[PDB]
């Protein structure tokens, strides 16, 4: 097996052709497509852009909320000059459950809507001809998948997603689909670990190939070689290394090659930032110095396109995060497109990487009969995420769950499995966390013991004791924080969520909940609490921007806790954060 | 700005809007209004259902230790409201409670005192009613038997089975109506409340709850049910205009179920209601 | 070797997209060329392509930058392409472009809305990476399309001063594609349709840069239905399935150069068979009258400016179908080819418009730079018709938007361009232009050249709005009585009418800027349209709110959209849906 999660690159040995554009599309309400031969051509179809969720193109709700099997189809050319090479199709992701057919032959299956996979087609494609690519997708939710939920059936027989999570169940092909030509012997993986030294830095590496020819690794500052090594394991000695820092990124160029004499059998290239990250004495140390995390929980969410990758929106989001003085964000509730991490690497932003283990909430959750099948799917996602993302300088922590019912029996065995795995799989041994739900308190949470740092999602002053009660909210908040003080045992804490829904058009004096003035007051109270406790070492606000949810009486066209609108313009709270975050030192509270 | 203060400019605008939209009736939802509002109803020819502030009556409510003292305050309010308003041509019925827990033990004793009193005090013996909460069903309400006509407050498609569930909301609404048909004993029914919160600035296609398109679709679904049942003889929508509530996660600067904004300007739904209500004859369904 | 054909992959051709994150730098001092920036930017930021650069930034100075700026990327040329011609296609580059590869300047282009190629066969290194550097300039002048001025602020910074009502978005707005092509290749082809008793016949021409034999084959699906040899010929299609409004049918055309048993080059494309002509004051599509209904659009969306985004295109078409439109005009510049491909597939009619907007104030067409403007106008008309002529959806050419056609010099300028459009278009489709409010039946020197008249009128908005709307209708009806006397049996459509409308505003009774006023305005205008037999189409301004330069009249851009910029309906969208889906396709087609 030649599994590889490496980003597709063009090199002397590798080719890449994007298959994005307008595809053919059809719902399959009776699940008849396979036996009816739809993999060889849809009888009826519409056009559908890839990448994008399908939901928000339509003007009818039945299509927006379709839940079941659906098909994507396109034709791709395979140049004849590729005939010596391995041929594969990379899917950045496909949501949620995928079956891939090429020329009518089923060539791949995949579980989980937010991580990449390849379909090898070397012996199925016709060369110098067009070939049919058919993708049978399904977007139904069940209780043993990431993310977790249910599928209901309406009184008219129609299926509808019923998530256990607070975001719309967007599905489709959300990320670029890329046809690749690869040499039969090739680099499948590599890893880097960094060490600071008196003369500079040292990068310890491994490379994994599917063959035995010789491996070299060269490191370049621009076009100037600064270090090289031979062998699948080694050390790169970088004199006076230029370290990657917050808002001061520096990226070297790594070149990995397989050699057969004077012939280069395979070349893989990628940017690499050199930096250390670790928890010591209740602080996050980046290159040996403390950093106070500030930023957001985000979503892959925008108007029209659902979760589809859009480099324009990504660019605007980073411009806004720099303007506001953020330095960190969490990939709230699923791994993002690789491109978002690539830009974080360039811009000097810190990332907490999170698998889609959200909705594990109300017998308690971790005693359900399906817990073993869920754990399997969870290990798979955790493995692929760490494998895909481990070499990004920007990625500094792993978040293993969001708001699980960690008061349930069965929590310890479940968490121990996954937290050990995260330790095993990450060569850099980055810290591990999970977002603690409101119902899980210092005194009853069976899961908090496993985290290297505690991440709280708290809504004191919104879901509890909002409005005129915010005085009581603050007192109840401090009460819980005194509880955490007794179980932390020197570990740091961050907030991964806090926020208040806010209509971007709403002004009131005095404030009311849903007004911009209330949002500012809400945030000031929370920051007063944060600043009161030595062990609070970061604040990520919920959310960067307004985003879509299922309809309900609580959701005024989606979630309105954004600091920015869905159109990436600031609410009043954006200027409050800008004043706070740009005025706190990078090492705020670093001596506490 | 003025809260509940009387302001004849606003009253005048409210009547201009009710005439424009084709309304003929309103209920004094949750408390008796200032006299001037009934005087204008008399001048313009509107029907009024007069309601005392017996709202919030959530051990069941009517087994509480303070029930005797509540009843005494309720008797006084009913007496002064009928005493003050009985001579208005516009006032044509008495609403004695809004959404009491009329499944509670002790409901019958409390209701009988008050409904008997309303009969004794009114020289014109106008019909008596109360707004029935959603949890009070044909098969478990101990209070509906007292009403001369039934007034339902229903939110099928808002609080219950909203959004993509509206198809289920309509089915459950019809089933419950089928159950009311068996207890009405020939009495008429009106809806005193139905509605959906709507930001006056929100448009979406397809609709989402809180959009003006959802408000229109919600109203259409409900009207289709109303029109299916011969015994439905009136429809009062909640609410005429956005109004202030206590702060809360459910209230985007107060209640937004208004057909008009708090500034007395129409949302899309006002044009839906204008087209419907001005097209129905005054005696719509009068032979059914 | 000029060719405006859409880049395709075939047995002889390769295409690799260069879209993604590029490097970018402003060049405020215009120093980059002499400073060797083409071999690498000293300082740079990342920038998505395709997109406008403007709306990413948080500072106004960057959003409003006017001058030289650079885009750069590295691109791989596979060694297996040796022997092929290597070219980089730019869908567009706004406004004035100089292209460098490995430090060598290989192309220049004028005009920000039409494609061009940079041939780099002998400049690139094979099986290696090469540096692509793009020096762009977005300054406006009075002799370009579109027209404007570039002002200098008191701090010395330049700022665009358009003579047109849309923001001066610039950047690389459309896909950049690297191509490998055979040295002898198809450069162009044209089709021309005729209906017959037995089906349809397609008269074609093909242009190549060589002498080897040419064949043309037409396939229904995979099923060949016609073929022919020669650079000119006819394809006989029995029982031809015609392309129709909201009912498209597309055949596949395959053009090949042959050298014995070898296919030297192959080009493929979809083609819809249909006729379109003006007869007795009506638009005839496949011989039957069509009443045009729809919009003026823009290439405009949140964040990306005029950047191509298939997601927004798909939504726009879903909304146009939902509302009952059948037609739009490419308001004030040719759009990305992808929009026309979708119109071919969905059965939408398009009026293709060149960026000849801003020609207004000695009168405009007596300005000293008039001959320079005309030359740029001819090139854009040449490239637009050459690019778009084989689209079944394209059924008319708009040669200008609101020129001062009352000016001296109008006749000689217009004749040149209306004659040229016939020389450029084998199908001889109807030609028009959008007539400004100040140009009336009795004083317009331009209107006589149009095959159908297109009016932009704002009776009830810019003229006699509000309580004056009763006078606006009377003045409108008088002007229409005047047009009746000069039409000479020609049809008329409205290409613009509309009223700015905040999507949040309700008032009873209406005020200008409220949704109720927008509805009343449209009702008044439609009452007038329906009073005149010669009105054969209505295109409202605009499909969606779009960005303009800042100003007291522009509440964050133009608010005349029927949809918001986020593609949600205002009240008037429901008004149009009820009207446009109630009108028969051949509405007013017998009068
Ligand atoms: O919601 C958000 O914005 C985001 O927050 C996170 N999660 C936080 C907790 N969570 C809730 N979501 N919705 N409602 C409530 C909670 S908890 C809670 N507790 C409540 N009471 C506690 C006991 O005393 C009285 C108050 C009440 C309510 C809620 C709402 C109904 C009435 C009272 C799920 C989402 C998610 O990580 C994030 O993906 C999501 O977007
Ligand atoms: O609310 C209005 O606009 C107006 O309506 C009337 N009253 C209607 C019912 N009433 C409610 N107020 N707020 N929330 C709920 C109800 S009932 C209900 N049922 C619910 N579930 C029941 C079981 O099945 C599924 C649905 C849920 C909720 C509510 C809210 C949280 C989510 C689930 C009190 C006010 C008042 O006469 C009026 O003065 C007031 O202004
Ligand atoms: O504007 C739009 O929305 C769109 O319309 C088209 N164009 C139409 C006319 N045009 C104008 N733009 N702005 N203002 C005026 C005009 S004409 C006119 N005439 C006026 N008076 C003439 C003499 O009698 C009394 C009325 C007055 C005004 C205007 C403005 C101030 C009040 C008096 C240029 C743009 C463009 O093709 C389109 O790209 C643009 O987006």
mmCIF file of C-alpha atoms in Angstrom, chain B residues 16-112:
data_model
loop_
_atom_site.group_PDB
_atom_site.id
_atom_site.type_symbol
_atom_site.label_atom_id
_atom_site.label_comp_id
_atom_site.label_asym_id
_atom_site.label_seq_id
_atom_site.Cartn_x
_atom_site.Cartn_y
_atom_site.Cartn_z
ATOM 1 C CA UNK B 16 -54.614 53.757 9.990
ATOM 2 C CA UNK B 17 -52.509 50.608 9.550
ATOM 3 C CA UNK B 18 -55.224 48.224 10.743
ATOM 4 C CA UNK B 19 -57.672 49.754 8.240
ATOM 5 C CA UNK B 20 -55.084 49.598 5.454
ATOM 6 C CA UNK B 21 -54.438 45.910 6.152
ATOM 7 C CA UNK B 22 -58.139 44.983 6.361
ATOM 8 C CA UNK B 23 -58.297 44.008 10.051
ATOM 9 C CA UNK B 24 -61.584 44.221 11.919
ATOM 10 C CA UNK B 25 -60.591 43.043 15.412
ATOM 11 C CA UNK B 26 -57.921 43.058 18.106
ATOM 12 C CA UNK B 27 -57.511 41.590 21.578
ATOM 13 C CA UNK B 28 -56.133 43.730 24.452
ATOM 14 C CA UNK B 29 -53.280 41.218 24.796
ATOM 15 C CA UNK B 30 -52.288 40.675 28.363
ATOM 16 C CA UNK B 31 -53.878 43.626 30.205
ATOM 17 C CA UNK B 32 -56.861 46.318 29.679
ATOM 18 C CA UNK B 33 -55.754 49.220 27.483
ATOM 19 C CA UNK B 34 -56.135 52.953 28.022
ATOM 20 C CA UNK B 35 -59.728 54.123 27.519
ATOM 21 C CA UNK B 36 -58.758 56.215 24.502
ATOM 22 C CA UNK B 37 -58.012 53.053 22.495
ATOM 23 C CA UNK B 38 -61.579 51.790 22.899
ATOM 24 C CA UNK B 39 -62.986 55.227 22.104
ATOM 25 C CA UNK B 40 -61.189 55.110 18.752
ATOM 26 C CA UNK B 41 -62.369 51.539 18.171
ATOM 27 C CA UNK B 42 -65.921 52.851 18.705
ATOM 28 C CA UNK B 43 -65.298 55.656 16.181
ATOM 29 C CA UNK B 44 -63.694 53.477 13.506
ATOM 30 C CA UNK B 45 -65.776 50.311 13.839
ATOM 31 C CA UNK B 46 -63.322 47.763 15.221
ATOM 32 C CA UNK B 47 -64.263 44.812 17.391
ATOM 33 C CA UNK B 48 -62.344 44.368 20.646
ATOM 34 C CA UNK B 49 -61.793 41.327 22.840
ATOM 35 C CA UNK B 50 -61.114 42.754 26.315
ATOM 36 C CA UNK B 51 -58.517 40.910 28.436
ATOM 37 C CA UNK B 52 -57.529 41.277 32.126
ATOM 38 C CA UNK B 53 -53.801 40.833 32.991
ATOM 39 C CA UNK B 54 -54.307 37.173 34.028
ATOM 40 C CA UNK B 55 -51.109 36.108 32.282
ATOM 41 C CA UNK B 56 -48.235 34.048 33.627
ATOM 42 C CA UNK B 57 -50.261 31.425 35.522
ATOM 43 C CA UNK B 58 -47.481 28.986 34.474
ATOM 44 C CA UNK B 59 -47.668 21.111 42.131
ATOM 45 C CA UNK B 60 -50.021 22.575 39.512
ATOM 46 C CA UNK B 61 -50.508 26.326 39.274
ATOM 47 C CA UNK B 62 -54.011 26.312 40.718
ATOM 48 C CA UNK B 63 -52.965 24.226 43.744
ATOM 49 C CA UNK B 64 -50.524 26.894 44.951
ATOM 50 C CA UNK B 65 -50.980 28.170 48.498
ATOM 51 C CA UNK B 66 -51.479 31.734 47.213
ATOM 52 C CA UNK B 67 -54.350 30.762 44.876
ATOM 53 C CA UNK B 68 -57.113 32.324 47.062
ATOM 54 C CA UNK B 69 -55.283 35.668 47.060
ATOM 55 C CA UNK B 70 -54.664 35.449 43.295
ATOM 56 C CA UNK B 71 -58.366 34.796 42.719
ATOM 57 C CA UNK B 72 -59.270 37.866 44.791
ATOM 58 C CA UNK B 73 -57.011 40.062 42.649
ATOM 59 C CA UNK B 74 -58.403 38.415 39.515
ATOM 60 C CA UNK B 75 -62.011 39.040 40.584
ATOM 61 C CA UNK B 76 -61.233 42.713 41.198
ATOM 62 C CA UNK B 77 -59.553 43.176 37.783
ATOM 63 C CA UNK B 78 -62.414 41.437 35.952
ATOM 64 C CA UNK B 79 -64.928 43.624 37.834
ATOM 65 C CA UNK B 80 -63.200 46.907 37.012
ATOM 66 C CA UNK B 81 -62.581 45.962 33.365
ATOM 67 C CA UNK B 82 -66.201 45.018 32.730
ATOM 68 C CA UNK B 83 -67.282 47.971 34.870
ATOM 69 C CA UNK B 84 -65.123 50.379 32.876
ATOM 70 C CA UNK B 85 -65.683 49.018 29.344
ATOM 71 C CA UNK B 86 -69.187 47.506 29.187
ATOM 72 C CA UNK B 87 -70.773 50.385 27.219
ATOM 73 C CA UNK B 88 -68.310 50.369 24.274
ATOM 74 C CA UNK B 89 -69.947 49.078 21.096
ATOM 75 C CA UNK B 90 -66.458 47.915 20.061
ATOM 76 C CA UNK B 91 -66.076 45.538 23.044
ATOM 77 C CA UNK B 92 -67.769 42.268 22.053
ATOM 78 C CA UNK B 93 -66.136 39.606 24.285
ATOM 79 C CA UNK B 94 -64.194 39.032 27.512
ATOM 80 C CA UNK B 95 -60.870 37.203 27.664
ATOM 81 C CA UNK B 96 -60.428 36.039 31.232
ATOM 82 C CA UNK B 97 -56.879 34.537 31.083
ATOM 83 C CA UNK B 98 -53.951 34.167 28.683
ATOM 84 C CA UNK B 99 -52.232 30.760 28.656
ATOM 85 C CA UNK B 100 -53.035 29.523 32.175
ATOM 86 C CA UNK B 101 -51.992 26.017 33.162
ATOM 87 C CA UNK B 102 -55.534 24.816 32.681
ATOM 88 C CA UNK B 103 -54.496 21.159 32.949
ATOM 89 C CA UNK B 104 -53.673 21.800 36.614
ATOM 90 C CA UNK B 105 -55.663 20.480 39.549
ATOM 91 C CA UNK B 106 -57.957 23.166 40.896
ATOM 92 C CA UNK B 107 -58.577 24.707 37.466
ATOM 93 C CA UNK B 108 -62.344 24.141 37.507
ATOM 94 C CA UNK B 109 -63.056 25.883 40.814
ATOM 95 C CA UNK B 110 -60.982 28.934 39.837
ATOM 96 C CA UNK B 111 -62.411 29.195 36.297
ATOM 97 C CA UNK B 112 -66.031 28.745 37.398
#
